[PDB]
A paper describes a structure:
The global gene regulator known as regulator of proteinase B (RopB) and an eight amino acid leaderless peptide signal, SpeB-inducing peptide (SIP), form an intracellular receptor and intercellular peptide signal pair that controls speB expression. The SIP peptide is produced and secreted during high-bacterial population density and reimported into the bacterial cytosol, where it directly interacts with cytosolic RopB37. SIP promotes high-affinity RopB-speB promoter interactions and RopB oligomerization. GAS integrates a pH-sensing mechanism with the SIP signaling pathway through a pH-sensitive histidine switch in RopB.
Thus, to help elucidate the molecular basis for pH dependent, and sequence-specific SIP recognition by RopB, we crystallized the C-terminal domain of RopB (RopB–CTD) bound to SIP. Thus, we used RopB–CTD that has the entire tetratricopeptide repeat (TPR) domain (amino acids 56–280) containing the putative peptide-binding pocket but lacks the N-terminal DNA-binding domain (amino acids 1–55). Thus, the region containing amino acids 159–200 of RopB was built as single α helix in the RopB–CTD–SIP structure. Each asymmetric unit has two subunits of RopB–CTD, and only one subunit in the asymmetric unit has defined electron density for SIP. SIP is oriented with its N-terminus facing the solvent-exposed exterior of the pocket, whereas the C-terminus is buried in the deep end of the pocket. The SIP-binding surface in RopB is formed by helix α6 of TPR 3, helix α8 of TPR 4, and the C-terminal capping helix α12. The peptide-contacting face of helix α6 is lined by N152 and F155, and the surface of helix α8 facing SIP has R188, N192, I195, and Q199. The side chains of M267, F268, Y271, and K278 of the capping helix α12 are positioned to interact with SIP. Given that RopB–CTD has decreased affinity for SIP compared to full-length RopB, and RopB–CTD–SIP was crystallized under nonoptimal pH (pH 7.5) for RopB–SIP interactions, it is likely that the structure of RopB–CTD–SIP represents a low-affinity state. In the structure of RopB–CTD crystallized at pH 7.5, the side chains of Y182’ and E185’ (where ‘ indicates the amino acids from the second subunit of a RopB–CTD dimer) are oriented toward H144 but located farther (5.8 and 4.9 Å, respectively) to interact with H144.
Residue numbers in the entry:
A (entry chain C): 1 to 8
B (entry chain A): 56 to 282
C (entry chain B): 56 to 281
Amino acid sequence: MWLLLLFL
Amino acid sequence: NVDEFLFISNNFKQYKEFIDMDTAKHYFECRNIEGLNHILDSYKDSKSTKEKNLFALVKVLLATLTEEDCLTERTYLSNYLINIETWSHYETVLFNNCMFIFESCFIEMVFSKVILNLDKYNTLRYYGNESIRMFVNMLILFIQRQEYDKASEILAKIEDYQLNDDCLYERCCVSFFDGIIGLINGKEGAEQKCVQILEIFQLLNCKTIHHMFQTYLEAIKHKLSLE
Amino acid sequence: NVDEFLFISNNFKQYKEFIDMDTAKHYFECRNIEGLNHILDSYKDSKSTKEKNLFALVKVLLATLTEEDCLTERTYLSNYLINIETWSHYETVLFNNCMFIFESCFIEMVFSKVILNLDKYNTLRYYGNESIRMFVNMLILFIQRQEYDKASEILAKIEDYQLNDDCLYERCCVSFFDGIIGLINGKEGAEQKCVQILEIFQLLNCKTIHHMFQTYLEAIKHKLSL
């Protein structure tokens, strides 16, 4: 459960 | 499905006109025995503005192939495009198909017109990359879960079937990531591979996307420093 | 115009299929030399469900004309329509164009299907009357401003050019209103003209619209006491 999402 | 049908049928004629232009253009590439027939069809017709447009188009196409060149149609097509309140696709497609016939003076002003009304083509272009945006996320996620193999499979797969596409931002992303996989692996070519495309993003002055691709490469380089 | 173009081109094939059916139906009305050509086209093809449908359709059409009854196709078309998760226009248009070929047991069960999925056709009819709903409002307003002449012009105009329509609820509204104008004027027969159509609304059991047309006629009759 890392806190990331989407980006490029 | 009904509403759809209705909608299409209503606009079928307008769509039909696009098909005519396309086929008429094809005939221009070579044979024109039927090329003359379309004129015979739409000569006595010559009612709708768009049907005169078609006529004039075929005219100037035929003309360029024959010895005689008829300019009254050339001027007709000219003024039509010059006087346009709102630029549509039809206007583009026409403009394209007869741009060579056109005097530069028109073309330049037509260009002024068309330069505002590209809004739609642009927003439309974004959604082409809605497929790619998704593909990268997968890769970004696969590396983030250190599934180097999975990520490599995705790439190999999407280069096999995107092989036909001939799109840039695609081939960039695959190359960059074909890099970043090699780099995290530890093979030689890859360290420079990723920067090679990063050049292009800097060179072509895509500061926004350059930033993202760059900062990312640094960020993984960071984590692999630990290795 | 681009998005539209895009949308159409994507669904062109599906639309194209509607055209084939229509033209194939036309051929059935008379000449059929090319009737086999669609087959020649779709025999060597004969792939995809909808293209088999077309094939089978032309088959049973051609067959009905010649001295043959072809069962495998008649059954094929049958089960296709019987097994449909969601009924589309295509399904109707197909069902229509081959209903005569179909056995009644299917037709009745097909009917069961089509009864739910008329939702779209109905809401679509409403907007047909969006023209009429407007026309009456003008009349209703013209009488409300006692512009008897204006109102009568509207009527005379809209009967001249709706002349072609052959629609009921139209001809009702015009007749009813051709009534109350005569009634407010004061010539005889007009008072009875209005009730004549009001019968139809009661007879055909249109309680909703009957109520409105009725209560209105009463309401103007009321004011015409003066």
